[PDB]
């Protein structure tokens, strides 16, 4: 499986695009349309299935497919790695995390950005050493287990075990 197959459990490939509650527009998994020349807002619908549409390279009128958001998320994934490996913080962890717990932590980026993954200090010291199950335990002293324990119990197997165990069913 990949990390796409985890994302679009943890969070949900929404094949429609849908414009943001606060002033922005999604589709697939969380992809906002408008980033540019450093102007987040697309300025419409219509030039915000333009842009989509260009990306893809078809006449969508505002909807994509699963595999069409496949080749965005990771797309978004890339631009995630590039976005840690600037962070001196968690570069370092990074680098040493195997592809499975690679794609645990770029999970909990696209979650709460590099500054909350940044912030649980000791429990990616943690898994720079790799000592998993240490690891594991002190990341769920946090409200973020609380805030959301199912999509953390899975990350958190993910990095335990570094197998995809916790998805093997969705």
């Known amino acids: 499986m990949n990390i796409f197959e985890m ?5 949900g490939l929404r094949l429609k695009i849908y414009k943001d509650t606060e002033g922005y527009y999604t589709i697939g998994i969380g992809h906002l349309l408008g980033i540019g020349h450093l102007l987040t807002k697309s300025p419409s619908l219509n030039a915000a299935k333009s842009e989509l549409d260009k990306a893809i390279g078809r006449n969508t009128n505002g909807v994509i497919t699963k ?14 790695v ?39 200090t000791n429990s990616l010291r943690m898994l720079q050493q790799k000592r998993w199950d240490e690891a594991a335990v002190n990341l769920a002293k946090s409200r973020w287990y609380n ?7 899975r990350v958190i197997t993910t990095f335990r075990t570094g197998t995809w165990d916790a998805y093997k069913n969705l």
């Open 67 to 80: 595999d069409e958001a496949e080749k965005l998320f990771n797309q978004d994934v890339d631009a995630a």
């Open 82 to 120: 590039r976005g840690i490996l600037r962070n001196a913080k968690l570069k370092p962890v990074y680098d040493s995390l195997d592809a499975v717990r690679r794609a645990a932590l770029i999970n909990m980026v696209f979650q709460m950005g590099e500054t909350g993954v940044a912030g649980f």
């Open 7 to 11: 994302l679009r459990i943890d969070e």
């Open 147 to 153: 805030q959301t324990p199912n999509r953390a119990k």
